[PDB]
Each structure stands twice: as C-alpha cells, then as structure tokens.
Design a protein around this ligand. Structure first.
Ligand SMILES: COc1cc2cc(c1Cl)N(C)C(=O)C[C@@H](OC(=O)[C@H](C)N(C)C(=O)CCSSC)[C@@]1(C)O[C@@H]1[C@H](C)[C@@H]1C[C@@](O)(NC(=O)O1)[C@H](OC)/C=C/C=C(\C)C2
Ligand SMILES: Nc1nc2c(ncn2[C@@H]2O[C@H](COP(=O)(O)OP(=O)(O)OP(=O)(O)O)[C@@H](O)[C@H]2O)c(=O)[nH]1
Ligand SMILES: Nc1nc2c(ncn2[C@@H]2O[C@H](COP(=O)(O)OP(=O)(O)OP(=O)(O)O)[C@@H](O)[C@H]2O)c(=O)[nH]1
Ligand SMILES: [Ca+2]
Ligand SMILES: [Mg+2]
Ligand SMILES: [Mg+2]
Lengths: 424, 69, 440
C-alpha cells in the first residue's frame, strides 16, 4: 500500500541497483520473468512496496533506469533479471557525461531530466499511497553524481511532502584513478545535505578494505564490492519489505534516525562478512569498525541514533540482552541527551545462504572522517584550481565550488558540535 | 431560596457552555496557526528549489556566452 | 440506559480493544457472530451487559465501540479476523497514511482529514443510546495517532458532548517494546492537551506489564499479545461493575468520586492479582487475604512507582468471583495492621470495596490461570507522579538540544507548544507534591 519508487542513475547506480533487485527478488520469490514461485506468504505481504502487479500475476519492479550513456541500458537489459524491468522505464541519452558533474547537473543531464520525470510521474500516479523514492548512484562520476542530484531536486519540487532516500557511493583513490572525483563528490554532498531526508553512505574505500583485508581478495573487482553493497541494501530495507513494527516505512525510519535535518548521513554495517554465528558474536561484529560500509571508526565519535536489524531464527531474549550489553559496555559512544536511541528489529526470514545475519544503521558523528577525507582531496586540487576549466566550460562559477566546500565543512562542524555536547 | 436555586443551575449551564465555547475557539485557533505554519514551511522549500532553477538557467546562459568567444 | 461507548485509537488502542472485547464476549457468553443464546430478549433490552453491547433484531450483540487508525493494516486484521462478524464495517475506520510516530501529523496534518468522519460514526452510536454515560478511550502515549489523534478527538468530544464523562486507558511507553525515540515528546504533548478534557485516566506502563509477564508468567520475551491479554483482565475488572450487576456491586462512578479530589489529580494507580500460571496455580487455592496482600506489592502495579514513598488519597478494591464481605474486611484489617498505608491528612482512610460474583474468565491459549477469585486495586497515590518525572526527564534531555523537533515544526507546530506542554507537566508534578503536604 505504501509504495516506494526506485531510481538508478549512472553506471554505478545501475550496477548496484540491478544487484539489489536480483537479491530481494530472490528473497520475495520472484523469477526473472516476474512470476511468483515462493514458499511463504510473508514474501507477498508487503510486495507492493517495491513491485507493481501486472496481468497474469506478474510482479514488475517499480524501478526507473537512467544514464546519459546507452551502454548501461543494454548490460542491465541483457542481465539475469534484465527482462523483469519495464521497457518504457529505460531512459537514456547518447553523449555520456564523462565524469563531469556539471554536464550531468546543468548541461547534458538537464536535457534528459524531463523525460525521466515523465516516467516518475507515471509510476507515482499509480501509487495507492506513495511514501517516497530511493536513488542508487555514485558521487564520483558525472551522471549518477550530477544528474542524480538534479533529479532529486526536481522530484522534490513535485513531491515535497515525500521522503527522499539515497544510496550514495563515495569515491576512493583505491578503486578509481579519476582525479576529479573529490570535485564531483563534494558538489554532490552540497546537494544531498539540502534535499535528501536520509542518505546511506556506501564508501568504496570501506568496500575495498573489507574485500582486501577481511575477505582476503588480492585484486577486488566491482563485482566483489557490489556483493557487499547488495547484502547491505537488502538488510537496511528488510524492515520495509517484510511485516514488522520498527521502522516499517521511510518516514518512521527518518523520525528515529534523523535528530537534525542536515545530519542524515548514515554509516551502514553488516555481519557476518565472509568469503571462502552466535547472537553475541553477531552483535559484536555489527558494531565492529571492520564491518562498517563507511571508512570511519565509530569509537572516534558518538552515535546519535542506531537501527539494528537481526535476521534469521534466533532467541529474541538473547538479542535483547546483548543489545543492552553493548549499550552499557559502550555507553560513552552513545550521546546521553537522546535516551533509548538504539532500536532493534528481528525478522524471521534470513538472507540467501545465511542462517542468521545482522544489519546495522548508525548516525555517528564519526561520519565526519569520511567527509574530511573528501575535503582533503578536494582542497588539494582547488587551491591550485586544477582541471577547473572543464567545469567552468559548462558555465559554472568558481564561487559554487567555494560554497560546496564551505557547506561540507559546516556539516563536519555540526557533527563535531553534537559530539562534544553534554546533557549537563 | 427559589431565586438562588435558579441562579445555581443557570450558573452550571453558563460554565458548561463557556467551556465548550473556549474549547471550540482554542482548537480552531490551533488548527489555523498550524495550517499557516505548514504552508509557509512548504512555500519556503519551493522558493529555494525555484532559485536553483533560476541559477541553472544562468549557468546555461553563461556557457552560451563563453562559447563563441 | 447508562450506555458506554468505547473508542480505540491507533495500533495499541485497537489491539488492546481486540483483547478486551474478546474477553467481554467470553464473559457474557457472546459468540463470534454476535449471538448470545442466554439473552431471551431479542432486538434489545436493559440488562447490564447492554451498557457495552447493543442489539439487532436478528439477535446480534454489537459492541458499542469505534476502532480508528490512520493506517489500515492493524484494523484490517479485525475486519478479516475471528470476530469480524461482531462489528459493523462502519465501526472500523481507517486511513492510508499513518502519523509516523509524530503527534503533529496525528493531531493536524493527517488527523484533520478523518476527524469529521470519526465523529459522525461516534454520533451514530450515541443516537442509539437512551442514556449515554460517557466514553472510554484506548490509546498509546507514544504513537503519532495514539497521541495526536486522541488529543484532537478528546478536544472535539468535549465540544460535541459537553462535560459528558470521558475516561482514558493510556499506554505509557517502555523501551523494551517502544518503536520511536520521540515517544517522550508525543507523551508530554498529548497529556498536556487531553488533561482538561479527561475526567479519569488509567495509565498502563508497558514495562510494568512486561515485567509481570516475565516474572509471574515465565514468559521469556513477552509480545503485545502477552501484554494485551493481561491488560484486558485489568480493564475487565474495572468495567465489570458496569457490565454486570449484583447486590455487592459498586458502580465505577462511585469509585471515581473517591479517586479524584481535584480535576487534574485523576490518574489512579491500578494493581491486579493474582497473576499466576496454570502450572503454579494447580493445587494452589489463592485466598481473599492473599490476593489482597498482593495489591500492596509494587511488583503487581500497572505503573512502576513506589507508593511506600508517597501518600494515599484513596484506596478502592474491586473484587470479582468467590468473595464475601467478611473475608475482605478481615484481610483489610490484617493489612492495615501489617502494612503502613499512609494517607494524606485531609482524606478518610477507609477502603471502598466492590464485589461482582461473576468469576474471572481467561481466553484460550492464554498463560493466565483461571482463578476462582481476583481483585483490582484502584489507588490514588502521589507516587504516580514518578511516571511523569521519568517521562519529563527524557523530554528535557532531548528538547534542550531540540533533537527531532524539526519533524514537528515541519508539520506546522511551534516550539511554544513544546514549552507550554512541558510547563503544564511541571505544574502537574508540583500539584502532586502539594496534595501530599500536611495541612496547617
Ligand atoms: C595528466 O593529465 C590528465 C589527462 C587526462 C586525464 C587525467 C589527467 Cl591527470 N585524469 C587521470 C583525470 O582524472 C582527469 C579527467 O579524467 C578522465 O577524463 C577519465 C579518468 N578518463 C576516461 C581518462 O583519463 C582516459 C585515460 S588518460 S591517463 C592520464 C577528468 C574527468 O577530469 C576531466 C573532466 C572533468 C572531464 C574529462 C572528459 O572525460 N569529459 C569532460 O567533459 O570532463 C574528457 O572528454 C571525454 C576526457 C578526458 C581525458 C583527458 C583530459 C586525459
Ligand atoms: N561499488 C561500486 N562502485 C562503482 C561501480 N561502478 C562504478 N563505481 C564507482 O562510481 C564512481 C563514479 O563512476 P560512475 O558511477 O561509473 O559514473 P556515472 O554515474 O556513470 O557518470 P558518467 O560515467 O560520467 O556518465 C567511480 O568512482 C567508481 O569507483 C560498481 O559497480 N560498484
Ligand atoms: N501494550 C501494548 N502497547 C502497544 C501495542 N501496540 C503498540 N504499543 C505501544 O504503542 C507505542 C507506539 O504507538 P502505536 O499505537 O504503535 O502507534 P499509533 O497509535 O498507531 O500511531 P502511528 O505513529 O500513526 O502508527 C509504543 O510505545 C508501543 O510499545 C499493543 O498492542 N499493546
Ligand atoms: Ca436482550
Ligand atoms: Mg557512465
Ligand atoms: Mg500505527
């Protein structure tokens, strides 16, 4: 009844977006043709959150695929579940963005944005009660970073009373050698802090470090990183997709997770992280720095709010005891002026391949470590005005780079403020 | 005594009615203040979004001005 | 005559309504299709159970109740559930978008869109009444609908029904089963707004019910189902004087006279016994003396607080089942001797007593043992103010930093409403101190 509209923009956005749909389709018992062959009615209880129902009991993802490059469309379309998507929901240009945020936001993407919006409107018009939108994209590119933030602003114009959620992929020199990624990222964050209600920070730096150090993969591929992302995205949307009490919709999540409107950048976490458990162990790991999908140490800041999601058949008594154990033993890392800020949900349905897992969503002031890293890479190039001509060539001004830098620095300060805050 | 008896019951009526009245007024005032505040919050949000559109037009205008030169 | 309309608001209100009405039906011998073989007067009557049940010509006994929630999933389960036949569809009212644990959305944004419809349906029930006594409102403090819509409804009911009696059953939040960080906000806001529109309010601390289920019923991790089945027994004990009648029966309104010394001091503490499992109750006769003693053990209270550290303004005992006045008087005499029950100096110390001969009932599959005799104590103690103090403390910690306040402002509310509500609460805590002070 409460429908979410999915949007995936750019190469990264579509890649992780596709994997996301593959994973939950399996969980809900949907096949690539859109037919249901499942074993539990819990799968279809809240299927209308992500799936439209068509003739012949076919389930179609309420998904919109976007890119200024037509290559992405074919790859998805000829993918495993490529035939599940709605053909008319494919929207694409030809010229590409070429890692230029200005092209995606003001020039090339601005030409294409209207045709995307038309598809959004058609999906939303058919919603019994649209709760909001979720976007998958990267902040390092130009389409996902530039056109994605544009789409957000335009969608917010027509649905200002709906929740805007984003799965933003952060750039890292360890995965990508494109040097202007700190420019594109900072310019994107400048938009996200103003026009999104809740942003999951997917850090490629953290995805790489996990694959290399923990999973012990010498040369991690984009497919190795996305395996983590899909497992995370499946976890943080568990409460939305299955019958439950806690954070069952996007707005209730936002109310529990966002104490101040700007501070809505979450640090997701997952457990177990494994490639070729007890409830206490699950709980330990999900709060471990080695299990965070953002390159931040939570012990270098304080938790404003936390949403924990346990999946699988287990003892809820044990979960309740352990979650209390963590908060008491690590009370210094939870702000005291927000009582009972850690909420816990338990879903009986485990993800594919696992007996039981744990998904963590934290609003930590330690997220500033992530923004500080980008700011350091950004300023190193901006102080010398490097590669700026490609952006100003599209009509941008230098002052817009200044403002984005400043606003991002402000966000950091604000996280530090509430980190240093006390009750007395 | 009879006059006092009348004065008591009509005082009870008067107080019950004044309660109903003030409750009705308090509520209508609250629902009106809330309506104006929420609309103003939304109006300001769009006002900021519409200045982003204006800014975007200046960017595309500035590009066109840089091109031929 | 003396009809009583029940209004169940939000998830907690509705699901507790399910428990209560299921229990009422079993107590009166009413089937899920509304039929009642023992009732020989078809189409109507003026028996005691008719205060809670109306009657159709077809012999159907219909709850004088309305169910309201701003989203449909919780009430849909009533519509398709075991007792779907029991209610007329127009008694079950639903929206599409809930209040998202926000008082503002419940009272204003979303609530305003359905309030008129609800009042119309309530009016339809009122028109069936020959002598309407008042309303019983079931709701949570923490939910957006339970807090916001309830306050809106209570305000509106005072307008449309003047000073007709309005009683509350309010679910006070507990972290073990809470679903929102801002429940302290929703709690203080709804308590402030409803205070002058409510005549009497029975608070149910979920943590108290949670503990009782864990300790006395050996339930490892209680569910809402566990909590609700215990709450319904307490609600049943309180309404039993309205639904049944006997020589020794004392109407709830008489207790209310003793329980409310000032309009704002209208929050009675409830204590119920015996809460005991079937395993433990086997070959265990719980006497009138034993269950009455249990009423003064704080572990059995509906609200976590310490009456030993406060003063009493009233003490009511609502017995049901195999209980005679002789045993009761003996048990009280023992208690007055053994326990130090300290009253304020401006109230008499005598306990008011009521007895319904109909014994307690239990629902199948429940954990409560079916006992021959039960009791519910309704006391007015200054100790109840502890529950305000805990909530008010949590409110202050967040509001000092204005945490989450933007969610309320964005829906049209002002910070003035927060400070105004908190001040009323501060005045209320102070009122409870003042009544406890000895006279000059
Ligand atoms: C030593 O100087 C350099 C020279 C060149 C690239 C770089 C450096 Cl440092 N690198 C590593 C950068 O990250 C800057 C730019 O990156 C890329 O365009 C990506 C990474 N790419 C596909 C290649 O570099 C090809 C391999 S050359 S190895 C040195 C980039 C993104 O910053 C520019 C702007 C923002 C882009 C360039 C372009 O892609 N399109 C556009 O409009 O803006 C444009 O038109 C399609 C193409 C750009 C290609 C060049 C300018 C080559
Ligand atoms: N984790 C993950 N990151 C990816 C993937 N594909 C691309 N990225 C990252 O995304 C960032 C931006 O690149 P893209 O998303 O491909 O750029 P785009 O959104 O398609 O925009 P344009 O290429 O300019 O049209 C880079 O830093 C990549 O590291 C992916 O499959 N998984
Ligand atoms: N005792 C008891 N408490 C409940 C029950 N359901 C919810 N609660 C409590 O109610 C509070 C949340 O309010 P809800 O009733 O769930 O929310 P609501 O009234 O539907 O309002 P919305 O925000 O619009 O959903 C929490 O503190 C819960 O612990 C129940 O069935 N029994
Ligand atoms: Ca009859
Ligand atoms: Mg691309
Ligand atoms: Mg609800």
């Amino acid at each position: 009844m409460r429908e979410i509209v999915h949007i995936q923009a750019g190469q990264c956005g579509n890649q992780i977006g596709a994997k996301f749909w593959e994973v939950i389709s399996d969980e809900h018992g949907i096949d690539p043709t859109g037919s249901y062959h499942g074993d539990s009615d819990l799968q279809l209880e809240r299927i209308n959150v992500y799936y439209n129902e068509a003739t012949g009991n076919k389930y179609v993802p309420r998904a919109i695929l976007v890119d200024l490059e037509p290559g992405t469309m074919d790859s998805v379309r000829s993918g495993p579940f490529g035939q599940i998507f709605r053909p008319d929901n494919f929207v694409f240009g030809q010229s590409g963005a070429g890692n230029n945020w200005a092209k995606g936001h003001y020039t090339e993407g601005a030409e294409l944005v209207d045709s995307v919006l038309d598809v959004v409107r058609k999906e939303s018009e058919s919603c019994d009660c649209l709760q909001g939108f979720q976007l998958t994209h990267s902040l390092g590119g130009g389409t996902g970073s530039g056109m994605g933030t544009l789409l957000i602003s335009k969608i917010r114009e027509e649905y200002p009373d709906r929740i805007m959620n984003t799965f933003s992929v952060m750039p890292s020199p360890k995965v990508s050698d494109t040097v202007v990624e700190p420019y594109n990222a900072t310019l994107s964050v400048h938009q996200l802090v103003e026009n999104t209600d809740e942003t999951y920070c997917i850090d490629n730096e953290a995805l790489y470090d996990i694959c290399f150090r923990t999973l012990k993969l010498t040369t991690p591929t984009y497919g190795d990183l996305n395996h983590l992302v899909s497992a995370t995205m499946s976890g943080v949307t568990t409460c939305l997709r299955f019958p439950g009490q806690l954070n069952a919709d996007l707005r209730k999540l936002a109310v529990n997770m966002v104490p101040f409107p700007r501070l809505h950048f979450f640090m997701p976490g997952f457990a177990p992280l494994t490639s070729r458990l007890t409830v206490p162990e699950l709980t330990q790991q999900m709060f471990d720095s080695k299990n965070m999908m953002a390159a931040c140490d939570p012990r270098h800041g304080r938790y404003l709010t936390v949403a924990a999601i346990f999946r699988g058949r287990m003892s809820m008594k044990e979960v309740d005891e352990q979650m209390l154990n963590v908060q008491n033993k690590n009370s210094s890392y939870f702000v005291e002026w927000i009582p009972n800020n850690v909420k816990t949900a338990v879903c009986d349905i485990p993800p594919r391949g696992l007996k039981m897992s744990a998904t963590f969503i934290g609003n930590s002031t330690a997220i500033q470590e992530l923004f500080k890293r980008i700011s350091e890479q950004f300023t190193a190039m901006f102080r010398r005005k490097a590669f700026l001509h490609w952006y100003t060539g599209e009509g941008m001004d230098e002052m817009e780079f200044t403002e984005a830098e400043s606003n991002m620095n402000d966000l950091v300060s604000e996280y530090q403020q509430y980190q240093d805050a006390t009750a007395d | 005594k009879r006059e006092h008896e009348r004065e008591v019951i009509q005082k009870a009526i008067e107080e019950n009615n004044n309660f109903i009245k003030m409750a009705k007024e308090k509520l209508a005032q609250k629902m009106e203040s809330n309506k104006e505040n929420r609309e103003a919050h939304l109006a300001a949000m769009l006002e900021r979004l519409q200045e982003k559109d204006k800014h975007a037009e200046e960017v595309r205008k500035n590009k066109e001005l840089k091109e031929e030169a | 005559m003396r009809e009583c309309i029940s209004i169940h608001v939000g998830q907690a209100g509705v699901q507790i309504g399910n428990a209560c009405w299921e229990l009422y039906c079993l107590e009166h011998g009413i089937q899920p299709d509304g039929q009642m073989p023992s009732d020989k007067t078809i189409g109507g009557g003026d028996d005691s159970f008719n205060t809670f049940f109306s009657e159709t010509g077809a012999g159907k006994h219909v709850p004088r109740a309305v169910f309201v929630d701003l989203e449909p999933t919780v009430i849909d389960e009533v519509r398709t559930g075991t007792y779907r036949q029991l209610f007329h569809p127009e008694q079950l009212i639903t929206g599409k978008e809930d209040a998202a644990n926000n008082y503002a959305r419940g009272h204003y944004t979303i609530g305003k869109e359905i309030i008129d419809l609800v009042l119309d349906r309530i009016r339809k029930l009122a028109d069936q009444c020959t002598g309407l006594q008042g309303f019983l409102v079931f709701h949570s403090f923490g939910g957006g609908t339970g807090s916001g819509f309830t306050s809106l409804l209570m305000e509106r009911l005072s307008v449309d029904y003047g000073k007709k009696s309005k009683l509350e059953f309010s679910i006070y939040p507990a972290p073990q089963v809470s679903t929102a960080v801002v429940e302290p906000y929703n709690s203080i806001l709804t308590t402030h707004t409803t205070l002058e529109h409510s005549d009497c309010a029975f608070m149910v601390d979920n943590e108290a019910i949670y503990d009782i289920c864990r300790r006395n019923l050996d339930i490892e991790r209680p569910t809402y189902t566990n909590l609700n089945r215990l709450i319904s027994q307490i609600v049943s004990s309180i309404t039993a004087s309205l639904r049944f009648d006997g020589a020794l029966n004392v109407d709830l309104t008489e207790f209310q006279t003793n329980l409310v010394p000032y309009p704002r001091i209208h929050f009675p503490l409830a204590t119920y016994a015996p809460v005991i499992s079937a395993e433990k109750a086997y070959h265990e006769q719980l006497s009138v003396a034993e269950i009455t003693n249990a009423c003064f053990e704080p572990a059995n209270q509906m609200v976590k607080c310490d009456p030993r550290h406060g003063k009493y303004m009233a003490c009511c005992l609502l017995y049901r089942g195999d209980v005679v006045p002789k045993d009761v008087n003996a048990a009280i005499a023992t208690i007055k001797t053994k326990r130090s029950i300290q009253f304020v100096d401006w109230c008499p110390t005598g306990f008011k007593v009521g007895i319904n001969y109909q014994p307690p009932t239990v629902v199948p599959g429940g954990d409560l043992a079916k006992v021959q005799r039960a009791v519910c104590m309704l006391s007015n103690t200054t100790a109840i103010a502890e529950a305000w103090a805990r909530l008010d403390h949590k409110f202050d910690l967040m509001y000092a930093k204005r945490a989450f306040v933007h969610w309320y402002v964005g829906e049209g509310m002002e910070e003035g409403e927060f400070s105004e509500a908190r001040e009323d609460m501060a005045a209320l805590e102070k009122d409870y101190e003042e009544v406890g002070v000895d006279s000059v």
